[PDB]
Symmetry: D2
Amino acid sequence: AWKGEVLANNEAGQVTSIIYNPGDVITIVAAGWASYGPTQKWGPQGDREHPDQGLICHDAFCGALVMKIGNSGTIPVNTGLFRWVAPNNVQGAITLIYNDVPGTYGNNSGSFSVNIGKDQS
Amino acid sequence: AWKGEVLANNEAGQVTSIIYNPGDVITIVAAGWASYGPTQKWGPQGDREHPDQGLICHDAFCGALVMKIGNSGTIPVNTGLFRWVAPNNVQGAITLIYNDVPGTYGNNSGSFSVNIGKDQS
Amino acid sequence: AWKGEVLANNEAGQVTSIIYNPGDVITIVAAGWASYGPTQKWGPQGDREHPDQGLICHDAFCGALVMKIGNSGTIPVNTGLFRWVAPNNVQGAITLIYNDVPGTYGNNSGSFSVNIGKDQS
Amino acid sequence: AWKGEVLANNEAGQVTSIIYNPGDVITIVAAGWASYGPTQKWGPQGDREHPDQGLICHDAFCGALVMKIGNSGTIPVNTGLFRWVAPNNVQGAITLIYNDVPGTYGNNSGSFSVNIGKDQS
Ligand SMILES: NCCCC[C@H](NC(=O)c1ccc(O[C@@H]2O[C@H](CO)[C@H](O)[C@H](O)[C@H]2O)cc1)C(=O)N1CCCC1
Ligand SMILES: NCCCC[C@H](NC(=O)c1ccc(O[C@@H]2O[C@H](CO)[C@H](O)[C@H](O)[C@H]2O)cc1)C(=O)N1CCCC1
Ligand SMILES: NCCCC[C@H](NC(=O)c1ccc(O[C@@H]2O[C@H](CO)[C@H](O)[C@H](O)[C@H]2O)cc1)C(=O)N1CCCC1
Ligand SMILES: NCCCC[C@H](NC(=O)c1ccc(O[C@@H]2O[C@H](CO)[C@H](O)[C@H](O)[C@H]2O)cc1)C(=O)N1CCCC1
Ligand SMILES: [Ca+2]
Ligand SMILES: [Ca+2]
Ligand SMILES: [Ca+2]
Ligand SMILES: [Ca+2]
């Protein structure tokens, strides 16, 4: 299992110790408060009122937690994933990333605290 | 395991199929959008800007997900709990509840979708 | 989880720290060598060649590992149980017992080493 | 998870659907009766009275269940393994094998029924 902080201003993402392998079942729980620029902060589902202006993940709101697994595209995490299996041919290191527009992370603030574990399979 | 919806206007709370027993380890993941009255909606951590005016759980924001286990007091759930063990002598049916002031649930809207499972122990 | 030894001469059984509750899934692995009297020893499945002369569990061989859950009848364990659920209305403390005829435990020898854990549910 | 039969006469071993990856925790439970030649049969710990005359696994009795993980040497399984982690650098497909001397499997009989699953990690 892995526990750690994902900074909202970390454009490259937070690498975890989790390597997702074929057949794995995982659970993620994310908590905390972060911002993509405004003084207000949002939880790991992000800001439901904000337009997508080129987010790294178009399937989650700006300010949401997302992830990549190896060479995958971004996959929404939001508050977490319960006993979750990846799509076919998706495998590798899990990197967690705050959802913002590339090149616009410098004014971000806050962080999410995230647990990831492998479940029975 | 249990999956279901917790309505923000449900003052009595949503009873689950989970009976927490001594020694159990549980994981909860909650998602979605709800309001305690305003047109805006918040995620399961609630509204970090809103003053506590008599919430059923003083350890979580207004609009957060909380729970009772048997005859316990309220316990924060927020976005979820990862491989969590209850305090001593806490046991019984898990009921999930939206955090608001007693008597003020009628103007609430939305809901959270919640998974609960028992982990290895 | 519980790990401990079950002596072949222990007529009363070895009480464990496991309380089986409704809905629980458990795994048991048993190992080792024991005898119901002869110089030879057998593993947790017991002696397949020996007639049942009034065993506490008629559904397992003499010398097998069996269990009781609360006030249940005896249930075969043998080498173990994989992600196992009890029959309806079966619940309570798990006691592990060597399968022999009542009153004939005094000449028994050896023991089994047993792990029990609760699985995801 | 995998469930299947391991024939005592199968010199090459039974390939399973389990790929052991770094960090994985696994549980195995094995049951049944098999022989390395004699009319008698033994459980998955094999025959404690039989000399090692060139067994594929010198750390288990003749007639015991053993395994290889990828290109590993043989590892005893016996009645099973509880929440088990492999030695460093051991990974790959799990193959289950009856412990006998190479070239002597033709007179073997019986089989073990085996479950393998991955546990939380
Ligand atoms: N009178 C003021 C008008 C602005 C209101 C609003 N636009 C925004 O609210 C807005 C808010 C914050 C922003 O912050 C920037 O977000 C980017 C990602 O989209 C980057 O993260 C930047 O770093 C961040 O500053 C951008 C637009 C707007 O026009 N809306 C809101 C719904 C559609 C109409
Ligand atoms: N010019 C307008 C002034 C109001 C602004 C604000 N007060 C509130 O924002 C407020 C907002 C929503 C409320 O909704 C009610 O919340 C209750 C729980 O506290 C019940 O759920 C009611 O059903 C709900 O309507 C109550 C107060 C306020 O005074 N603040 C905000 C920080 C401290 C100072
Ligand atoms: N020429 C010798 C004849 C004896 C052989 C055998 N009977 C037994 O092998 C036997 C062996 C051990 C026993 O030990 C006792 O077992 C009891 C439980 O059954 C108690 O545990 C006693 O403590 C133990 O001594 C009893 C009978 C027998 O008659 N068989 C074997 C298959 C059916 C026919
Ligand atoms: N009067 C008869 C003497 C034989 C008794 C015994 N040797 C064996 O019991 C024995 C039994 C079965 C065997 O079966 C063969 O085992 C091989 C693996 O070791 C292969 O599996 C062969 O296929 C199988 O036939 C081999 C030796 C022996 O000498 N012992 C037993 C303890 C040490 C002294
Ligand atoms: Ca930004
Ligand atoms: Ca309200
Ligand atoms: Ca006896
Ligand atoms: Ca042989």
